[PDB]
Amino acid sequence: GGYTCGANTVPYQVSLNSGYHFCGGSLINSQWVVSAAHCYKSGIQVRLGEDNINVVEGNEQFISASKSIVHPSYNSNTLNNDIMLIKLKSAASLNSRVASISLPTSCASAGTQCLISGWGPDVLKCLKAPILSDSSCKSAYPGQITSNMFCAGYDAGGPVVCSGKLQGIVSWGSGCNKPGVYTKVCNYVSWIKQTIASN
């Protein structure tokens, strides 16, 4: 179950702020964040180094987003391809509390434990959970799971990290025997790398 992570123990976790915290994201290099496409809105400020999002604790960096790129195939009705890129107006200063997370070179296997993190209650919360089998995932949500999603279990846009790689983005679910559903990042690595290299 969920627990308090501890301040800055997830240094790639970002908060997206439009006047309030509305979604999480993951820092993938000094200039770029990955989040969920369903988090898209105007006027995004990226907040790095956060623990308590309501208190300035001394390790934060606040940087305006300069560009947002929603995946070309994003379908908001089904949440298929629920992934977006956010460019920072200026490069983050990387340190022990503000660090990038590596993209995977291959997909993760069912049964691998992952760290899922996010807010939602003002400090960062964490959950360790294994990737579920395809059958368990699709049986929980008949007709709704595509090859661009996976489930884990037993803050939209936040990271799912497995074996040191960003394998998922918090996308949707009904757990509020219904596990969380995550965008399958390994399907998008080419698109991520090309899109950031061209922007």
Report the helix count and the strand count for the chain, using DSSP H and E: 2, 13
Residues contacting 177, CB < 8 A, separation 6+: 140
Q: State this model's resolution in angstroms.
A: 1.2
Domains in the chain, CATH or no CATH each: 11-100+191-197 (2.40.10.10), 113-186 (2.40.10.10)
Residue 86 bridge partners (DSSP): 33, 68
Q: How big is the chain by its Cα radius of gyration, in Å?
A: 16
Integer Cα distance of 60 and 55 in angstroms: 10
Provide the greatest CA pair distance for the chain: 46
| 110 burial via Cβ count (<10 Å: 0-12, 13-18, 19+) | middle
> Do 33 and 138 contact (CB within 8 A), yes or no?
no
Q: Which residue has the tokens 């509020």?
A: 176
Q: Solved by what technique?
A: X-ray
Please spell the DSSP secondary structure of 116-171, one letter per residue.
Answer: EEE----S-EEEEEEBPPHHHHHHHSTTT--TTEEEE---TT-EEEETTEEEEEEE
Q: Which residue has the tokens 């702020």?
A: 17
> Do 66 and 28 contact (CB within 8 A), yes or no?
no
